[PDB]
Design a protein around this ligand. Structure first.
Ligand SMILES: Cc1cc2nc3c(=O)[nH]c(=O)nc-3n(C[C@H](O)[C@H](O)[C@H](O)COP(=O)(O)OP(=O)(O)OC[C@H]3O[C@@H](n4cnc5c(N)ncnc54)[C@H](O)[C@@H]3O)c2cc1C
Length: 367
């Protein structure tokens, strides 16, 4: 292989691709939107499961490191008042496909395993264009670059897939509001104490709460519901007041301990749940070698655990396919990775869609 591989986007998935290819002596750059490595990453914590994510980390020789930094959480399920089922983590079961790792910590682990200057920061891919033997890649206000194989790994909202497929992101019907409380021990003490160093989830009449009281000392929480008829949007995530107003109304029946969790949030993030659905087969005729992995390839609703792990397998199976050297052409290696990922991906989205229907039914319980 006289060639080089341009990975667009250094997510947890993208950076794993980079690592798995780099250890096999392949030329690779990671082109990342973010301004620099220290950029804060919003979101809850990721956890790598024993069969999938953990297995890719293992192959990058990074499991022990991920274990070091990850923190196993128990789980409390509560009503709109007090505790219904506690699930502390059993000692022989702690490394078990749970260790909750902070999204920045995981990037810090991945980046560290890569050779210096593998990732190029302040690189926003806005355009893609097939040349003679090379993809010319266009980055907003930066010098453009060229690669032999583009791997799209830029998340659920990738604007740059036309060369692989015509399908487009869909809204699934649900919606998520998310925030971080800092010093949750004094800022939302009642709620802090409900969690009792465990993760917490509660559901009441089509609203779901999920909180993790120790994401590197910040309480992160998400509230989730069916997207209201009114919208299609009519709450403004700029004014914290409209969000507060709306949340307090929806959470009227809930305990003071949760309401205090809304009042204290300085700012909220809104998001419609989306799916990049694995319905059609992707494009056959492809001018030069291009493929997609992680959320770019199969964005799917979060609610049932799924997300990064499928995207981490995508890295495991593609790197092997491009490295173990079984196929006669890059073009075969991709097609083979894709044949497989369509199987376990659809399997997953299906389970995901399902659980999303199941839990936003007006009568759901985690029981
Ligand atoms: C509320 C919520 C809760 C979730 N909970 C979980 C969970 O508990 N477990 C789980 O597995 N998943 C969860 N998910 C899904 C999970 O976050 C994703 O599967 C995972 O983060 C996707 O990783 P990725 O590397 O494939 O894409 P991403 O992590 O989104 O990374 C995309 C990278 O691409 C870069 N990028 C974007 N645009 C460009 C561009 N134009 N040019 C260059 N780079 C670009 C971005 O800068 C970013 O660094 C949740 C999602 C939501 C919304």
């Amino acid at each position: 292989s006289d060639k080089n591989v341009a990975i667009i986007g250094g997510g947890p998935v993208g950076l794993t691709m980079a690592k798995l290819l780099q250890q096999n002596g392949i030329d690779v750059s990671v082109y990342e939107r973010d301004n620099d490595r220290e950029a804060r990453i919003f979101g809850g914590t990721l956890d790598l499961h024993k069969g999938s994510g953990q297995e890719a980390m293992k192959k990058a020789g990074l499991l022990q490191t991920y274990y070091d930094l990850a923190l196993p959480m128990g789980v409390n399920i509560a009503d709109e008042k007090g505790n219904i089922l506690s699930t502390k983590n059993v000692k022989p079961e702690n490394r078990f496909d749970n260790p909750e790792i902070n999204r920045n910590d995981l990037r810090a682990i991945l980046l560290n395993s890569l050779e210096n200057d593998t990732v190029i920061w302040d690189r926003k891919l806005v355009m893609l264009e097939p040349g003679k033997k090379k993809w010319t890649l266009t980055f907003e206000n930066k010098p453009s670059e060229t690669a032999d194989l583009v791997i799209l790994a830029n998340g659920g909202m990738s604007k740059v897939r036309k060369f692989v497929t015509d399908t487009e992101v869909e809204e699934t019907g649900t919606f998520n509001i998310q925030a971080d409380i800092h010093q949750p021990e004094i800022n939302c003490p009642g709620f802090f104490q409900l969690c009792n160093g465990n993760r917490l989830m509660a559901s009441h009449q089509g609203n779901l709460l999920f909180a993790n009281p120790n994401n590197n000392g910040a309480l992160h929480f998400g509230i989730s519901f069916k997207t209201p008829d009114e919208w299609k949007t009519q709450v403004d995530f700029q004014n914290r007041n409209s969000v507060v107003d709306f949340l307090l109304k929806e959470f009227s029946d809930w305990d003071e301990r949760y309401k205090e969790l809304i009042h204290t949030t300085l700012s909220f993030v809104g998001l419609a749940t989306r799916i990049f659905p694995l319905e059609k087969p992707w494009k056959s005729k492809r001018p030069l070698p291009i493929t997609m992995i992680g959320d770019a390839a199969h964005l799917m609703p979060p609610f049932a655990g799924q997300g990064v792990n499928s995207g981490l397998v995508d890295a495991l199976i593609l790197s092997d396919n491009l490295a173990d050297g079984k196929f006669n052409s890059i073009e075969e290696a991709v097609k083979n990775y894709e044949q497989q990922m369509f199987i376990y991906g659809k399997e997953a989205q299906e389970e995901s869609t399902q659980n999303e229907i199941e839990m936003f039914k007006p009568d759901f319980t985690f029981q």
